[PDB]
Design a protein around this ligand. Structure first.
Ligand SMILES: N=C(N)Nc1ccc(O)c(/C=N/CC/N=C/c2cc(NC(=N)N)ccc2O)c1
Ligand SMILES: [Ca+2]
Ligand SMILES: [Cu+2]
Length: 223
């Protein structure tokens, strides 16, 4: 997260860190046994880490649970990143409490202008590199589809939306990948892609979660 702020320990209870010996992606807990992330975050041997703030220090509220199965969206295209969403099932159900909680799925899509909360342990520099140990937060508005498409001609599909600032300076970045974009207590987006970080006229692009609720629910009900 570039140009954001320190969230505060466990203030984003649904935020998870996907670990394969090191943090490599964010994720969102949607129930005691499932996590939603980006398909481009796929890899084997994933351990889901819940209740995390400083990912390099055991602070007392963590729950480390290995993933038993990963399900990449049936239509995920790694070249265009269309349908950049993946479900991860935990080998054991997480113990839900005030610091480890699930985030609700949307009942309807959000609109341009809606203020949302984006979070993650990704790079904090627009130029250069610096990874934080504690969770970072950024409040940002969803941008109109027209402005998004104008920012990225020929690349924005109906399963994507832009959020952030066209002026730059505040955006998601490498490491935040797969993380949440929550608006009014609902998971509306997943950190998917962009061009560089916090660059002018290059806002972050996110997977439009509302288009996948049917698939998520049906998949969870049978796995
Ligand atoms: N675990 C692997 N080895 N795979 C892996 C997993 C996740 C990964 O992301 C990558 C690799 N990522 C390359 C860089 N992605 C930047 C990026 C930018 C933004 N936003 C922006 N405002 N530009 C959002 C998301 C992003 O990923 C490789
Ligand atoms: Ca920790
Ligand atoms: Cu990436």
């Amino acid at each position: 997260i570039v140009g954001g702020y320190t969230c505060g320990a466990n203030t984003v209870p649904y935020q998870v860190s996907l670990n394969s010996g090191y943090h490599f992606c964010g994720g969102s807990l949607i129930n005691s046994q499932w996590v939603v992330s980006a398909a481009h975050c796929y890899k084997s041997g994933i351990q889901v880490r819940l209740g995390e703030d400083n990912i390099n220090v055991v602070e007392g509220n963590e729950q480390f649970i290995s993933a038993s199965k990963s399900i990449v969206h049936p239509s995920y295209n790694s070249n265009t990143l269309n349908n950049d969403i993946m479900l991860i099932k935990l080998k054991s159900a997480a113990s839900l409490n005030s610091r480890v909680a699930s985030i609700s799925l949307p009942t309807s899509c959000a609109s341009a202008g809606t203020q949302c909360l984006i979070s993650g342990w990704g790079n904090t520099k627009s130029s250069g590199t610096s990874y934080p140990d504690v969770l970072k937060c950024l409040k940002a508005p969803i941008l109109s589809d027209s402005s998004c498409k104008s920012a990225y001609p020929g690349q924005i599909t109906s399963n994507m939306f832009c959020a952030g600032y066209l002026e730059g300076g505040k955006d998601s970045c490498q490491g935040d990948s797969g993380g949440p974009v929550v608006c009014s207590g609902k998971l509306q987006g997943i950190v998917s892609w962009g061009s560089g970080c916090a660059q002018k006229n290059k806002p972050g692009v996110y997977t439009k979660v509302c288009n996948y609720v049917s698939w998520i629910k049906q998949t969870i009900a049978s796995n």
